[PDB]
Amino acid sequence: KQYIISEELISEGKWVKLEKTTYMDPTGKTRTWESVKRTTRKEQTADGVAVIPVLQRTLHYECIVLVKQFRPPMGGYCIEFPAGLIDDGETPEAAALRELEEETGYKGDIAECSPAVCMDPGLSNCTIHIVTVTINGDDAENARPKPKPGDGEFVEVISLPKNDLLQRLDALVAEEHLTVDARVYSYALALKHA
Amino acid sequence: KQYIISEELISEGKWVKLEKTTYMDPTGKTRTWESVKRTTRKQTADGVAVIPVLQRTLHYECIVLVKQFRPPMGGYCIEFPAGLIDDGETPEAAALRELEEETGYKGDIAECSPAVCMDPGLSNCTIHIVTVTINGDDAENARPKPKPGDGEFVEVISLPKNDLLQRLDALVAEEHLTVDARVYSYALALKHAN
Ligand SMILES: N#Cc1c(C(F)(F)F)cn2ccnc2c1Cl
Ligand SMILES: N#Cc1c(C(F)(F)F)cn2ccnc2c1Cl
Ligand SMILES: [Cl-]
Ligand SMILES: [Mg+2]
Ligand SMILES: [Mg+2]
Ligand SMILES: [Mg+2]
Ligand SMILES: [Mg+2]
Numbered sequence: 001k002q003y004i005i006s007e008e009l010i011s012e013g014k015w016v017k018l019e020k021t022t023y024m025d026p027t028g029k030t031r032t033w034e035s036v037k038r039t040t041r042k043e044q045t046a047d048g049v050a051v052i053p054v055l056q057r058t059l060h061y062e063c064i065v066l067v068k069q070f071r072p073p074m075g076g077y078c079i080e081f082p083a084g085l086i087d088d089g090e091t092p093e094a095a096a097l098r099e100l101e102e103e104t105g106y107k108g109d110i111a112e113c114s115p116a117v118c119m120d121p122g123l124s125n126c127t128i129h130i131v132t133v134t135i136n137g138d139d140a141e142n143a144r145p146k147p148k149p150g151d152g153e154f155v156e157v158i159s160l161p162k163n164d165l166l167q168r169l170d171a172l173v174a175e176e177h178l179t180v181d182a183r184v185y186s187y188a189l190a191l192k193h194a
Numbered sequence: 195k196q197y198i199i200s201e202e203l204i205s206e207g208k209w210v211k212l213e214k215t216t217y218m219d220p221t222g223k224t225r226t227w228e229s230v231k232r233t234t235r236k237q238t239a240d241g242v243a244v245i246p247v248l249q250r251t252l253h254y255e256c257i258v259l260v261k262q263f264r265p266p267m268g269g270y271c272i273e274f275p276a277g278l279i280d281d282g283e284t285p286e287a288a289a290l291r292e293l294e295e296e297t298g299y300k301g302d303i304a305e306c307s308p309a310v311c312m313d314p315g316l317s318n319c320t321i322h323i324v325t326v327t328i329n330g331d332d333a334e335n336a337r338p339k340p341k342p343g344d345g346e347f348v349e350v351i352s353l354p355k356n357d358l359l360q361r362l363d364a365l366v367a368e369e370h371l372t373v374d375a376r377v378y379s380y381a382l383a384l385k386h387a388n
Contacts, residue, residue: 002347025345034209036316074314075318083315114373121372182312182321189325
């Protein structure tokens with residue numbers, strides 16, 4: 001019984017806009033919100049994909065493959081699932097496998113694809129598909145994987161054992177200045193809680 | 195190798211601002227980013243998100259979530275109970291306060307994450323993930339009193355932890371809701387733990 005009344009552009013960048021959002025509260029009173037949106041979303045079911053990449057290899061514990069990048073908004077290095085925006089006309093699955101290969105060098109296999117999920121819904125309309133991908137680390141294609149960073153992409157690969165993910169992220173955070181992503185931390189917490 | 199040179203303000207609301215970030219790329223090339231920050235952070239992080247494990251004897255262990263209209267999303271989302279940390283408030287106190295206001299449950303701290311980033315390609319927004327247990331058998335949690343702030347309108351949804359991802363998937367299919375990415379990430383890891 002709540003809905004949007006109006007969305008007024010405040011400031012539009014090349015990549016991001018701020019909007020004044022007018023909506024109907026459930027007592028029937030008009031209220032406003034400050035909403036963030038990307039300018040890059042056309043007909044995609046979501047802005048982006050994040051990839052949960054399970055590196056599977058004979059006589060190895062399963063590893064979750066993570067990436068470490070400088071993030072200008074954070075002003076520092078962040079540990080995240082491999083991720084990127086969906087290109088116009090691209091499937092979430094294709095976006096996930098492409099971004100995984102570009103950022104890690106791994107050639108994955110689709111396992112599952114989430115519905116569109118919200119990144120920070122009190123702040124933004126931003127959505128991703130979370131795509132689970134298995135990587136056959138015994139395939140020659142995944143022997144010495146070579147990242148294909150695009151222009152201004154500078155990504156380091158960090159593979160951590162699934163069976164100790166939360167303690168290994170803690171050890172990485174204890175050792176320098178760097179933020180773990182909330183989705184990675186949430187995923188490492190559930191691995192412990194299970 | 196990479197660092198912030200300067201930030202230029204583009205637009206500042208009451209709650210959120212757009213900045214143009216200039217940063218040194220690791221080649222020595224100067225580059226720009228459109229960054230979002232909250233105006234409200236003055237704290238270890240902007241917010242807390244509470245993972246509330248509801249423990250009742252002879253019942254499945256449940257994860258308590260909240261359903262709310264999110265004006266940036268233009269729809270209803272399912273999320274961990276969550277809010278901004280008050281100036282001079284600790285992330286633990288924020289966690290117990292937000293949980294009681296949004297759910298009416300009175301919980302105990304199990305653990306508290308370091309600051310984790312919400313959407314680091316877009317914003318500087320950070321939270322503490324606070325794992326809280328709820329003794330659902332204690333009198334204070336019998337008929338729990340949810341205490342909305344000014345303009346909080348929150349529905350409580352407790353889902354069995356052991357089936358969490360299938361229960362969320364079902365809600366998306368029938369209730370045309372968006373699941374929060376951290377809720378989805380946790381739910382995936384509960385399945386992938388096996
Ligand atoms: N009221 C209100 C409110 C809040 C809060 F819930 F935290 F109080 C956060 N916001 C972020 C952008 N626009 C808003 C508004 Cl309008
Ligand atoms: N280039 C660039 C770029 C990109 C992307 F990597 F996706 F291309 C996304 N952004 C979001 C906010 N500012 C940006 C900029 Cl500057
Ligand atoms: Cl627990
Ligand atoms: Mg990326
Ligand atoms: Mg990329
Ligand atoms: Mg809240
Ligand atoms: Mg509240």
